Amino acid sequence: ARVLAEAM
Amino acid sequence: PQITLWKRPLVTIRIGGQLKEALLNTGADDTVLEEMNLPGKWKPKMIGGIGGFIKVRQYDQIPVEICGHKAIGTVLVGPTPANIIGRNLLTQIGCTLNF
Amino acid sequence: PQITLWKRPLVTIRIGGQLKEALLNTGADDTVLEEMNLPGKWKPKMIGGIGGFIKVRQYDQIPVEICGHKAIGTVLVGPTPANIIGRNLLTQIGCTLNF
């Protein structure tokens, strides 16, 4: 499964 | 309610009596919560994201309330920077994307 | 359009004269595309998620068509496990969460 949380 | 995306879509959730803030993530297949001691059996799992994989613990049939909407399902618990509500639970509270 | 979350929220975007599959991700501040060539000067940036941080190439004021709606903004390119349209462009096409 993928949890593509993202922040810079 | 209608939630805009000018800021991160953070909402309040009720898990096992404790209340925390979670990110509404359409980009997550599963719901991942910060480390916590939930009761019940759990199977080890690996989930991936942008910087690779992390091991988490999987709990099933876990009751969760999202901004007043009751849902129950799988919850992964691991060393995640933030609490994440994935699609497995969003499909349960009638959450849709619109434009 | 109204998009349900039983399946991954994938749509087709036109980056220049190129079609690509992208995931509408409200859990991402930025838009990250797999490694590809784009015009202009790029600055090296670092973004993180579950698993850690990765290095990416930043491109500014790039035109992107998302299911017919035009947007112009920042696009990051790098080793992402998947193409994702973040909140920076979702707000531009007036996308919201509802339930």
PDB file of C-alpha atoms in Angstrom:
ATOM      1  CA  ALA A   1       0.000   0.000   0.000  1.00  0.00           C
ATOM      2  CA  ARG A   2       1.020   3.633  -0.493  1.00  0.00           C
ATOM      3  CA  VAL A   3       0.651   6.584   1.838  1.00  0.00           C
ATOM      4  CA  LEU A   4       1.893   9.489  -0.245  1.00  0.00           C
ATOM      5  CA  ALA A   5       1.827  12.160   2.424  1.00  0.00           C
ATOM      6  CA  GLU A   6       4.215  14.934   1.387  1.00  0.00           C
ATOM      7  CA  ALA A   7       5.558  18.249   2.671  1.00  0.00           C
ATOM      8  CA  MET A   8       8.500  20.453   1.726  1.00  0.00           C
TER       9      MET A   8
ATOM     10  CA  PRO B   1     -18.728  19.902   5.524  1.00  0.00           C
ATOM     11  CA  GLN B   2     -16.875  21.382   2.560  1.00  0.00           C
ATOM     12  CA  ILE B   3     -13.139  21.560   3.199  1.00  0.00           C
ATOM     13  CA  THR B   4     -10.878  23.843   1.163  1.00  0.00           C
ATOM     14  CA  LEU B   5      -7.219  23.062   0.487  1.00  0.00           C
ATOM     15  CA  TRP B   6      -5.579  26.431   1.216  1.00  0.00           C
ATOM     16  CA  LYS B   7      -4.084  24.760   4.267  1.00  0.00           C
ATOM     17  CA  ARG B   8      -3.584  21.108   5.246  1.00  0.00           C
ATOM     18  CA  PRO B   9      -6.987  19.425   5.752  1.00  0.00           C
ATOM     19  CA  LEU B  10      -6.614  18.655   9.468  1.00  0.00           C
ATOM     20  CA  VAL B  11      -9.613  17.343  11.374  1.00  0.00           C
ATOM     21  CA  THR B  12     -10.359  15.941  14.822  1.00  0.00           C
ATOM     22  CA  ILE B  13     -10.709  12.205  15.257  1.00  0.00           C
ATOM     23  CA  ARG B  14     -11.796  10.032  18.159  1.00  0.00           C
ATOM     24  CA  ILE B  15      -9.817   6.842  18.614  1.00  0.00           C
ATOM     25  CA  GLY B  16     -10.292   4.706  21.701  1.00  0.00           C
ATOM     26  CA  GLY B  17     -11.298   7.681  23.830  1.00  0.00           C
ATOM     27  CA  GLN B  18      -8.316   9.890  22.993  1.00  0.00           C
ATOM     28  CA  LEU B  19      -8.846  12.774  20.559  1.00  0.00           C
ATOM     29  CA  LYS B  20      -6.182  13.722  18.018  1.00  0.00           C
ATOM     30  CA  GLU B  21      -5.713  15.715  14.820  1.00  0.00           C
ATOM     31  CA  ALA B  22      -5.445  13.789  11.579  1.00  0.00           C
ATOM     32  CA  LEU B  23      -4.728  14.682   7.968  1.00  0.00           C
ATOM     33  CA  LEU B  24      -7.401  13.880   5.386  1.00  0.00           C
ATOM     34  CA  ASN B  25      -5.208  12.182   2.778  1.00  0.00           C
ATOM     35  CA  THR B  26      -6.700  11.094  -0.555  1.00  0.00           C
ATOM     36  CA  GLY B  27      -3.137  10.114  -1.398  1.00  0.00           C
ATOM     37  CA  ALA B  28      -3.062   7.402   1.253  1.00  0.00           C
ATOM     38  CA  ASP B  29      -4.473   3.904   0.745  1.00  0.00           C
ATOM     39  CA  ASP B  30      -4.461   3.230   4.462  1.00  0.00           C
ATOM     40  CA  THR B  31      -4.912   5.112   7.691  1.00  0.00           C
ATOM     41  CA  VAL B  32      -1.688   5.516   9.634  1.00  0.00           C
ATOM     42  CA  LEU B  33      -1.615   6.858  13.158  1.00  0.00           C
ATOM     43  CA  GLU B  34       1.209   7.948  15.445  1.00  0.00           C
ATOM     44  CA  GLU B  35       2.448   5.313  17.885  1.00  0.00           C
ATOM     45  CA  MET B  36      -0.164   4.335  20.482  1.00  0.00           C
ATOM     46  CA  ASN B  37      -1.051   1.272  22.557  1.00  0.00           C
ATOM     47  CA  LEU B  38      -4.282  -0.140  21.177  1.00  0.00           C
ATOM     48  CA  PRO B  39      -5.764  -3.393  22.511  1.00  0.00           C
ATOM     49  CA  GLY B  40      -6.024  -6.457  20.326  1.00  0.00           C
ATOM     50  CA  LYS B  41      -3.911  -8.546  18.010  1.00  0.00           C
ATOM     51  CA  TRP B  42      -1.858  -6.994  15.205  1.00  0.00           C
ATOM     52  CA  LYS B  43       0.161  -8.219  12.226  1.00  0.00           C
ATOM     53  CA  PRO B  44       3.470  -6.564  11.166  1.00  0.00           C
ATOM     54  CA  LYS B  45       3.268  -4.634   7.929  1.00  0.00           C
ATOM     55  CA  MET B  46       5.442  -2.507   5.657  1.00  0.00           C
ATOM     56  CA  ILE B  47       4.029   0.613   4.013  1.00  0.00           C
ATOM     57  CA  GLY B  48       5.785   2.880   1.594  1.00  0.00           C
ATOM     58  CA  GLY B  49       5.699   6.530   0.775  1.00  0.00           C
ATOM     59  CA  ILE B  50       8.046   9.157  -0.629  1.00  0.00           C
ATOM     60  CA  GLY B  51      11.190   8.421   1.390  1.00  0.00           C
ATOM     61  CA  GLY B  52      10.858   4.643   1.379  1.00  0.00           C
ATOM     62  CA  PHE B  53       9.208   2.153   3.745  1.00  0.00           C
ATOM     63  CA  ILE B  54       8.503   1.931   7.463  1.00  0.00           C
ATOM     64  CA  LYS B  55       7.249  -0.980   9.530  1.00  0.00           C
ATOM     65  CA  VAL B  56       3.908  -0.496  11.260  1.00  0.00           C
ATOM     66  CA  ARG B  57       1.440  -2.604  13.216  1.00  0.00           C
ATOM     67  CA  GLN B  58      -1.949  -3.378  11.722  1.00  0.00           C
ATOM     68  CA  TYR B  59      -5.135  -3.449  13.772  1.00  0.00           C
ATOM     69  CA  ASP B  60      -8.492  -4.341  12.242  1.00  0.00           C
ATOM     70  CA  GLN B  61     -12.061  -3.448  13.179  1.00  0.00           C
ATOM     71  CA  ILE B  62     -10.930  -0.344  15.052  1.00  0.00           C
ATOM     72  CA  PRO B  63     -13.681   2.208  15.861  1.00  0.00           C
ATOM     73  CA  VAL B  64     -12.860   5.752  14.784  1.00  0.00           C
ATOM     74  CA  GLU B  65     -14.920   8.931  14.715  1.00  0.00           C
ATOM     75  CA  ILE B  66     -14.047  11.529  12.098  1.00  0.00           C
ATOM     76  CA  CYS B  67     -15.613  14.931  12.709  1.00  0.00           C
ATOM     77  CA  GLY B  68     -18.790  13.308  14.015  1.00  0.00           C
ATOM     78  CA  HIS B  69     -18.892  10.487  11.473  1.00  0.00           C
ATOM     79  CA  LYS B  70     -18.554   6.950  12.794  1.00  0.00           C
ATOM     80  CA  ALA B  71     -16.375   4.514  10.892  1.00  0.00           C
ATOM     81  CA  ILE B  72     -14.617   1.258  11.692  1.00  0.00           C
ATOM     82  CA  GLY B  73     -11.784  -0.402   9.855  1.00  0.00           C
ATOM     83  CA  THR B  74      -8.097  -1.123   9.630  1.00  0.00           C
ATOM     84  CA  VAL B  75      -5.627   1.167  11.347  1.00  0.00           C
ATOM     85  CA  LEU B  76      -1.863   1.025  10.954  1.00  0.00           C
ATOM     86  CA  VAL B  77       0.197   2.282  13.903  1.00  0.00           C
ATOM     87  CA  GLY B  78       3.810   3.234  13.405  1.00  0.00           C
ATOM     88  CA  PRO B  79       6.460   5.987  13.626  1.00  0.00           C
ATOM     89  CA  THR B  80       4.692   8.329  11.220  1.00  0.00           C
ATOM     90  CA  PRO B  81       5.383  12.067  11.464  1.00  0.00           C
ATOM     91  CA  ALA B  82       1.648  12.766  11.348  1.00  0.00           C
ATOM     92  CA  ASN B  83      -1.697  11.055  11.825  1.00  0.00           C
ATOM     93  CA  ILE B  84      -3.103  10.074   8.451  1.00  0.00           C
ATOM     94  CA  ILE B  85      -6.674   9.129   7.528  1.00  0.00           C
ATOM     95  CA  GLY B  86      -6.509   7.118   4.307  1.00  0.00           C
ATOM     96  CA  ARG B  87      -9.111   6.133   1.749  1.00  0.00           C
ATOM     97  CA  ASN B  88     -10.118   2.974   3.598  1.00  0.00           C
ATOM     98  CA  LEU B  89     -11.871   5.220   6.127  1.00  0.00           C
ATOM     99  CA  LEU B  90     -12.753   8.179   3.893  1.00  0.00           C
ATOM    100  CA  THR B  91     -14.965   6.009   1.714  1.00  0.00           C
ATOM    101  CA  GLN B  92     -16.871   5.234   4.920  1.00  0.00           C
ATOM    102  CA  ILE B  93     -17.775   8.806   5.857  1.00  0.00           C
ATOM    103  CA  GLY B  94     -18.977   9.672   2.359  1.00  0.00           C
ATOM    104  CA  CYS B  95     -15.904  11.770   1.578  1.00  0.00           C
ATOM    105  CA  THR B  96     -15.529  12.835  -2.053  1.00  0.00           C
ATOM    106  CA  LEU B  97     -13.288  15.166  -4.076  1.00  0.00           C
ATOM    107  CA  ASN B  98     -15.030  17.855  -6.093  1.00  0.00           C
ATOM    108  CA  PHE B  99     -14.170  20.386  -8.766  1.00  0.00           C
TER     109      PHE B  99
ATOM    110  CA  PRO C   1     -16.602  16.308 -11.396  1.00  0.00           C
ATOM    111  CA  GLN C   2     -17.330  14.302  -8.267  1.00  0.00           C
ATOM    112  CA  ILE C   3     -14.678  11.735  -7.338  1.00  0.00           C
ATOM    113  CA  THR C   4     -15.292   8.879  -4.901  1.00  0.00           C
ATOM    114  CA  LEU C   5     -12.436   7.214  -3.064  1.00  0.00           C
ATOM    115  CA  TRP C   6     -13.085   3.477  -3.570  1.00  0.00           C
ATOM    116  CA  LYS C   7     -10.201   3.490  -6.044  1.00  0.00           C
ATOM    117  CA  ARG C   8      -7.091   5.673  -6.108  1.00  0.00           C
ATOM    118  CA  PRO C   9      -8.124   9.137  -7.344  1.00  0.00           C
ATOM    119  CA  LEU C  10      -6.150   9.032 -10.619  1.00  0.00           C
ATOM    120  CA  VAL C  11      -6.716  11.490 -13.457  1.00  0.00           C
ATOM    121  CA  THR C  12      -4.991  12.429 -16.682  1.00  0.00           C
ATOM    122  CA  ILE C  13      -2.950  15.605 -16.808  1.00  0.00           C
ATOM    123  CA  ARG C  14      -1.349  17.293 -19.788  1.00  0.00           C
ATOM    124  CA  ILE C  15       2.079  18.613 -18.890  1.00  0.00           C
ATOM    125  CA  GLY C  16       3.076  20.471 -22.039  1.00  0.00           C
ATOM    126  CA  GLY C  17       2.326  18.172 -24.950  1.00  0.00           C
ATOM    127  CA  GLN C  18       2.490  15.081 -22.784  1.00  0.00           C
ATOM    128  CA  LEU C  19      -0.200  12.996 -21.097  1.00  0.00           C
ATOM    129  CA  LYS C  20       0.393  11.467 -17.685  1.00  0.00           C
ATOM    130  CA  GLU C  21      -1.522   9.694 -14.943  1.00  0.00           C
ATOM    131  CA  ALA C  22      -1.601  11.526 -11.604  1.00  0.00           C
ATOM    132  CA  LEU C  23      -3.114  11.008  -8.178  1.00  0.00           C
ATOM    133  CA  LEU C  24      -5.145  13.851  -6.621  1.00  0.00           C
ATOM    134  CA  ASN C  25      -3.429  14.019  -3.233  1.00  0.00           C
ATOM    135  CA  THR C  26      -4.760  16.292  -0.476  1.00  0.00           C
ATOM    136  CA  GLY C  27      -2.082  14.883   1.825  1.00  0.00           C
ATOM    137  CA  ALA C  28       0.673  16.608  -0.157  1.00  0.00           C
ATOM    138  CA  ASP C  29       1.561  20.312  -0.074  1.00  0.00           C
ATOM    139  CA  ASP C  30       3.389  20.047  -3.388  1.00  0.00           C
ATOM    140  CA  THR C  31       3.031  18.471  -6.822  1.00  0.00           C
ATOM    141  CA  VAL C  32       5.695  15.853  -7.550  1.00  0.00           C
ATOM    142  CA  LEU C  33       6.175  14.123 -10.880  1.00  0.00           C
ATOM    143  CA  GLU C  34       8.405  11.212 -11.760  1.00  0.00           C
ATOM    144  CA  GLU C  35      11.756  12.135 -13.302  1.00  0.00           C
ATOM    145  CA  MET C  36      11.146  13.895 -16.628  1.00  0.00           C
ATOM    146  CA  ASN C  37      12.640  16.699 -18.713  1.00  0.00           C
ATOM    147  CA  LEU C  38      11.115  20.139 -18.388  1.00  0.00           C
ATOM    148  CA  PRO C  39      12.123  23.539 -19.798  1.00  0.00           C
ATOM    149  CA  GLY C  40      13.611  26.248 -17.627  1.00  0.00           C
ATOM    150  CA  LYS C  41      15.993  26.580 -14.723  1.00  0.00           C
ATOM    151  CA  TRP C  42      15.425  24.341 -11.735  1.00  0.00           C
ATOM    152  CA  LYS C  43      16.537  24.667  -8.125  1.00  0.00           C
ATOM    153  CA  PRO C  44      17.363  21.591  -6.037  1.00  0.00           C
ATOM    154  CA  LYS C  45      14.852  21.142  -3.233  1.00  0.00           C
ATOM    155  CA  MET C  46      14.201  18.507  -0.618  1.00  0.00           C
ATOM    156  CA  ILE C  47      10.810  17.139   0.267  1.00  0.00           C
ATOM    157  CA  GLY C  48       9.867  14.478   2.771  1.00  0.00           C
ATOM    158  CA  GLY C  49       7.144  12.039   3.668  1.00  0.00           C
ATOM    159  CA  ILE C  50       6.834   8.627   5.256  1.00  0.00           C
ATOM    160  CA  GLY C  51      10.179   6.912   4.834  1.00  0.00           C
ATOM    161  CA  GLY C  52      12.163  10.128   4.783  1.00  0.00           C
ATOM    162  CA  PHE C  53      13.403  12.829   2.428  1.00  0.00           C
ATOM    163  CA  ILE C  54      14.270  12.847  -1.251  1.00  0.00           C
ATOM    164  CA  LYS C  55      15.983  15.396  -3.478  1.00  0.00           C
ATOM    165  CA  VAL C  56      13.932  16.922  -6.300  1.00  0.00           C
ATOM    166  CA  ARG C  57      14.221  19.479  -9.119  1.00  0.00           C
ATOM    167  CA  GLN C  58      11.924  22.470  -8.710  1.00  0.00           C
ATOM    168  CA  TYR C  59      10.274  24.103 -11.723  1.00  0.00           C
ATOM    169  CA  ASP C  60       8.251  27.297 -11.398  1.00  0.00           C
ATOM    170  CA  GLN C  61       5.272  28.672 -13.325  1.00  0.00           C
ATOM    171  CA  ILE C  62       4.684  25.458 -15.247  1.00  0.00           C
ATOM    172  CA  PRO C  63       1.342  25.037 -17.072  1.00  0.00           C
ATOM    173  CA  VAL C  64      -0.596  21.895 -16.180  1.00  0.00           C
ATOM    174  CA  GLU C  65      -3.972  20.737 -17.435  1.00  0.00           C
ATOM    175  CA  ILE C  66      -5.852  18.538 -14.965  1.00  0.00           C
ATOM    176  CA  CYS C  67      -8.890  16.851 -16.496  1.00  0.00           C
ATOM    177  CA  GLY C  68      -9.433  19.919 -18.637  1.00  0.00           C
ATOM    178  CA  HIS C  69      -8.801  22.569 -15.967  1.00  0.00           C
ATOM    179  CA  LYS C  70      -5.718  24.710 -16.473  1.00  0.00           C
ATOM    180  CA  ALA C  71      -3.323  25.612 -13.689  1.00  0.00           C
ATOM    181  CA  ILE C  72       0.078  27.326 -13.606  1.00  0.00           C
ATOM    182  CA  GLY C  73       2.497  26.763 -10.777  1.00  0.00           C
ATOM    183  CA  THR C  74       5.388  24.953  -9.138  1.00  0.00           C
ATOM    184  CA  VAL C  75       6.200  21.395 -10.127  1.00  0.00           C
ATOM    185  CA  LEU C  76       8.791  19.201  -8.432  1.00  0.00           C
ATOM    186  CA  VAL C  77      10.432  16.349 -10.343  1.00  0.00           C
ATOM    187  CA  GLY C  78      12.253  13.452  -8.709  1.00  0.00           C
ATOM    188  CA  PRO C  79      12.274   9.811  -7.477  1.00  0.00           C
ATOM    189  CA  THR C  80       8.661   9.831  -6.286  1.00  0.00           C
ATOM    190  CA  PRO C  81       6.908   6.466  -6.151  1.00  0.00           C
ATOM    191  CA  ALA C  82       4.053   8.111  -8.036  1.00  0.00           C
ATOM    192  CA  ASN C  83       2.898  11.242  -9.841  1.00  0.00           C
ATOM    193  CA  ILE C  84       0.890  13.388  -7.476  1.00  0.00           C
ATOM    194  CA  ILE C  85      -0.940  16.659  -7.840  1.00  0.00           C
ATOM    195  CA  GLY C  86      -0.642  18.448  -4.496  1.00  0.00           C
ATOM    196  CA  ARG C  87      -2.622  21.229  -2.828  1.00  0.00           C
ATOM    197  CA  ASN C  88      -0.706  23.932  -4.677  1.00  0.00           C
ATOM    198  CA  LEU C  89      -2.533  23.035  -7.905  1.00  0.00           C
ATOM    199  CA  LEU C  90      -5.688  21.518  -6.460  1.00  0.00           C
ATOM    200  CA  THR C  91      -6.657  24.897  -5.023  1.00  0.00           C
ATOM    201  CA  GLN C  92      -6.198  26.421  -8.464  1.00  0.00           C
ATOM    202  CA  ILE C  93      -8.849  24.209 -10.048  1.00  0.00           C
ATOM    203  CA  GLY C  94     -11.131  24.791  -7.086  1.00  0.00           C
ATOM    204  CA  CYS C  95     -10.944  21.305  -5.637  1.00  0.00           C
ATOM    205  CA  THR C  96     -12.494  20.569  -2.238  1.00  0.00           C
ATOM    206  CA  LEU C  97     -13.193  17.691   0.116  1.00  0.00           C
ATOM    207  CA  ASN C  98     -16.799  16.970   1.015  1.00  0.00           C
ATOM    208  CA  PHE C  99     -18.696  14.612   3.304  1.00  0.00           C
TER     209      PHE C  99
END
